[PDB]
């Protein structure tokens, strides 16, 4: 009997819902009631399922209606916990620890990071005489994302990005740019927020409305 | 034994965006992509064939040619997961994954596209200074038909005309665009909101006159 592990890491975007898996051999039909299944992380509780059932006087006041056990991948020989809405906080080492015919544990390291895929966009015509635009493309994640404005032709042009920390969700940071620029109806413009190390990038495609 | 499951069984998709749709299967020890078989269809469209460890891109549909993947990534770890990109309103529908895989099942995820108007543009003119009439516009674009509202921060009562059309970029969308003639001191702030139904979706732009 050995517990074993798909996947050894997982990198988990912030306000998702995350699955993470230890595998256990399964032969016949699922036995229930010799079943134990427990899931922790740093100490506290997350999940302990005995005879059948999620045993919730010993999970952590900080899993209350956050963690559950897929309960149908059981008898697949799956034990997924499934955490909804992943804070940065959720980071860290998992270990689950498996009990039927035979004992083993393992651990999963947990990654969070907040992507800078939800990107605002707004377009101001200042001025249609002298076709002068203002593009802005706003996003919130971490770490810091820098902005980059490109062209259809993909040349780099001139922006203003002012960084600060997020209102909404305290430990990220809001990142809005933007770029003043003389265009015409339909032209093509990107803005792209950029993180490295590793490299990053979300992108929104902006194009040059018609107004009357 | 065999079984294939949803941890979704409905995804709601922001037209123009990209959809990751997932579905599990049991994989124990290596993944032997020798025997895998993994089909994607909708309605009566083929979307991905992956027999014999490739997909087979034959029979797939117009719709999806250079837009629809198996994430073969995601295979080894026992989930099938289809990626269509730049999703459009006939995307909207019931998908369903057929996988052979040491047993056979198949499950069906509902996907609704959402279309909002939540990239507005504007403009502020001065239509003459003497008087500080200005004309304020409000424009954007998304399915089906919204009403334009506008507030101000001194809260008063505002009547805008607003003109509803197709839009000439994205067939499906309406194009709709308001515009408010007031008399305005600077740096008094203007808000356009966009109220649409189905479901109820309000996004506003804020208009600060300079
Ligand atoms: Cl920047």
Not at 45 to 59: C, P, R
Request: with cysteine; glycine share 4%; aromatic share 8%.
């Amino acid at each position: 009997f050995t517990v074993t592990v798909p996947k050894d890491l997982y990198v988990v975007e912030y306000g998702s819902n995350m699955t993470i898996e230890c595998k256990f051999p399964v032969e016949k039909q699922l036995d229930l009631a010799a079943l134990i299944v427990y899931w922790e992380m740093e100490d506290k509780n997350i999940i302990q399922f005995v005879h059948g059932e999620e045993d919730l006087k010993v999970q952590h006041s900080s899993y209350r209606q956050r963690a559950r056990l897929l309960k149908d991948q059981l008898s697949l020989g799956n034990a997924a916990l499934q955490i909804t809405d992943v804070k940065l906080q959720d980071a860290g080492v998992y270990r689950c620890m498996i009990s039927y015919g035979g004992a083993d544990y393992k651990r999963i390291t947990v990654k969070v990071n907040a992507p800078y895929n939800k990107i605002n966009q707004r377009i101001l015509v200042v001025d249609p005489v002298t076709s002068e635009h203002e593009l802005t493309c706003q996003a919130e994640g971490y770490p810091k994302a820098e902005v980059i404005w490109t062209s259809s032709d993909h040349q780099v042009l001139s922006g203003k990005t002012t960084t600060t920390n997020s209102k909404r969700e305290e430990k990220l940071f809001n990142v809005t740019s933007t770029l003043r620029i003389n265009t015409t109806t339909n032209e093509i413009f990107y803005c792209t927020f950029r993180r490295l190390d590793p490299e990053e990038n979300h992108t929104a495609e902006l194009v040059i409305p018609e107004l009357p």
